[PDB]
A paper describes a structure:
Bilirubin oxidase (MvBOx; EC 1.3.3.5) from the ascomycete plant pathogen Myrothecium verrucaria (Albifimbria verrucaria) is a member of the blue multicopper oxidase family (MCO). MCOs are capable of oxidizing various organic and/or inorganic substrates and reducing oxygen to water without release of reactive oxygen species. MvBOx, composed of 534 amino acid residues, consists of three cupredoxin-like domains with four copper ions forming two active sites. T1Cu is connected with the trinuclear cluster (TNC), composed of one type II (T2Cu) and two type III (T3Cu) copper ions, via a conserved His–Cys–His motif (serving as electron transfer path).
Here we present the first complex of MvBOx with a product, ferricyanide ion ([Fe(CN)6]3−), binding close to the T1Cu site, together with the structure-function analysis of the protein layer between the T1Cu site and the identified substrate binding site containing a natural post-transitional modification, the covalent crosslink between T1Cu-bound His398 and Trp39640. Complexes were prepared by soaking crystals in the solution containing ferrocyanide (substrate, see Materials and Methods section). In WT:FECN, the ferricyanide ion was bound in close proximity of the Trp396–His398 adduct, interacting with the main chain nitrogen atoms of Asn394 and Gly395 through one of its cyanide moieties and with the Arg356 side chain through two adjacent cyanide moieties. The shortest distance observed between ferricyanide and T1Cu is 11.4 Å. Moreover, ferricyanide in this position is not involved in any symmetry (crystal-induced) contacts, which supports the suggestion that this is a genuine substrate/product binding site. Therefore, we refer to this site as oxidation site 1 (OS1). The coordination of T1Cu in WT:FECN differs in two features when compared to those of MCOs without the Trp–His adduct (e.g. CotA42). The first difference lies in the fact that T1Cu is no longer in the imidazole plane of coordinating His398, but the histidine side chain is tilted by about 15–20°. The second difference is a longer coordination distance (~2.2 Å) between T1Cu and His462-Nδ1. OS1, the ferricyanide binding site of MvBOx, is a part of this positively charged surface near the T1Cu site.
Author numbering: 1 to 534
Amino acid sequence: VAQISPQYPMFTVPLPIPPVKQPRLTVTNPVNGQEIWYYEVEIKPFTHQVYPDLGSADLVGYDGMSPGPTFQVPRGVETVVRFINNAEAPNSVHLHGSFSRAAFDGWAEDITEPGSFKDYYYPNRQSARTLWYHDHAMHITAENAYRGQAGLYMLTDPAEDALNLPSGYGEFDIPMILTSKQYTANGNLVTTNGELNSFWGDVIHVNGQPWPFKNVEPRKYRFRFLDAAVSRSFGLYFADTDAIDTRLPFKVIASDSGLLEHPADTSLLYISMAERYEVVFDFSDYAGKTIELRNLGGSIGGIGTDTDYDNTDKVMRFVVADDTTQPDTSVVPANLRDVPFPSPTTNTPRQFRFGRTGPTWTINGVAFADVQNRLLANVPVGTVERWELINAGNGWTHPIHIHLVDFKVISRTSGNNARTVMPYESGLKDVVWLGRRETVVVEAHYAPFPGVYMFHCHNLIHEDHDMMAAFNATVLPDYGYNATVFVDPMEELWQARPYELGEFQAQSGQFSVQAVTERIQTMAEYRPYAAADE
Ligand SMILES: *[C@@H]1O[C@H](CO)[C@@H](O[C@@H]2O[C@H](CO)[C@@H](O[C@@H]3O[C@H](CO[C@H]4O[C@H](CO)[C@@H](O)[C@H](O)[C@@H]4O)[C@@H](O)[C@H](O[C@H]4O[C@H](CO)[C@@H](O)[C@H](O)[C@@H]4O)[C@@H]3O)[C@H](O)[C@H]2NC(C)=O)[C@H](O)[C@H]1NC(C)=O
Ligand SMILES: *[C@@H]1O[C@H](CO)[C@@H](O[C@@H]2O[C@H](CO)[C@@H](O[C@@H]3O[C@H](CO)[C@@H](O)[C@H](O)[C@@H]3O)[C@H](O)[C@H]2NC(C)=O)[C@H](O)[C@H]1NC(C)=O
Ligand SMILES: [Cl-]
Ligand SMILES: [Cu+2]
Ligand SMILES: [Cu+2]
Ligand SMILES: [Cu+2]
Ligand SMILES: [Cu+2]
Ligand code: NA
Ligand code: NA
Ligand code: NA
Ligand code: NA
Ligand code: NA
């Protein structure tokens, strides 16, 4: 249907690459002698000329950019991020794909108001994967993410570097953060505030930039795909501008939780809100050609209900040079890793129905705000459980995200006979798309930390009002590991704290080297992640 947003100079701006986020300093952990990387991120408003000939867009973003700066953290190193709210609305940051403790996981009610900050303590022990950090505050997640609070967080492993995949952030390892938004006639953003069904958007962005291009060499590149849209699911494929309907083959090497066992040969990649898929595409056969990254119409080939606009078929253009400056020395191994699948269970699965109770998106008839009823499962730490995630509807789709765990996709049924499990769903994931009349069974090890965590639809509109619930990963009184201060997300010890803007800008008071050091060392003494020492 007709584009609403003003006309855009398609494919004339280079793909922006988000700068790497650098820690301010390191703090010696008095428990294990090791350095903790400490960072400071300031949430704050800014403007961006999106359309060159019109007014500007009002955004609010981590370090006043969008997308957020990219974190690059090696397994083994613990990090503390101080997220400082200097905006006009509260925040709650969730590091998606990290088994953070409940109070550092971005619980929706665990907000930081403007004029406050919170110290997030992260383990970085899991399999190398593409995480992302984004807002998760109650009722306002959609608008906070839409206005720029999402960013990449790369967890790296020397062991994976030996696979010799295309490499170098910004070089031959390119982030591909997808979003879909709408613009007023003067090039400002059309707000999500008030939308209750779904906010599709008619302008496709990669890394913050509408319909860009990138000059690439005829060799192999690693693409880290993130669907950071509020509501738009994609069906991604590559095509020569000479043969715009003819899909070029590629390899999917990683899902949400890391590498697959083996590259999945693919020419169409379904990707819904909050899914990460890492792709290697070889441009060597297309020297001198232009390859368009494109999006499937017909509501993602009838899997979805998403509205399609004039140019939502288009994502970006790669302009391929005649030669490489240097030889492509990278490979894509047949065998990537041994995926740590959970031990199968024959325990009878729990059922969760993603539907509508009146005007409200619900889980098993319950809305997240209904505190009395929103705790839908107690699961003893260490248990494997199967959860049957059921979309009965033909008029909505739901990418379901379960915090804490990595899970395996066991099965998919479709009431429209559309599909079952995809080859790129062969690995470990933390989000799964319930397409039209789809029911999916997933299997997860509820481990290794006790605490109350969220699960929900990752359609941010549906998520806000109000398709979100909670599980408690429980332990018995004899357990230890300081679990008493770490199962309640609202725990006082970990709550946001006020700051004066002058302290922060001068790096004094609470922000002195000495005070940061006192704070981190104290946090580290509680030993948040001891139970995952092997
Ligand atoms: C998510 O799941 C977690 C478990 O992983 C739940 O947390 C547990 O909740 C129970 C109930 O609150 C806790 O048990 C209670 O402990 C409290 C204090 O215990 C300590 O201090 C007392 C003195 O005050 C000592 O005697 C004791 O040994 C401990 O050192 C008390 O409030 C409770 O005592 C009363 O209830 C029991 C129940 O039978 C009686 O036996 C007692 O005599 C007494 O009448 C109780 O023992 C447990 O400690 C919690 N665990 C952790 C790790 O925090 C979460 O509550 C759950 N969350 C949600 C939202 O459901
Ligand atoms: C659970 O968390 C608590 C609280 O942080 C841990 O107890 C604390 O352990 C640290 C050691 O890491 C103690 O440090 C102490 O410093 C003082 C100097 O003032 C010194 O006198 C002591 O010899 C020691 O080095 C700290 O006192 C202690 N805090 C309390 C309140 O006991 C505890 O280890 C954690 N338990 C687990 C299993 O993780
Ligand atoms: Cl750039
Ligand atoms: Cu998320
Ligand atoms: Cu998450
Ligand atoms: Cu949904
Ligand atoms: Cu979440
Ligand atoms: Na920065
Ligand atoms: Na401000
Ligand atoms: Na070739
Ligand atoms: Na886990
Ligand atoms: Na302490």
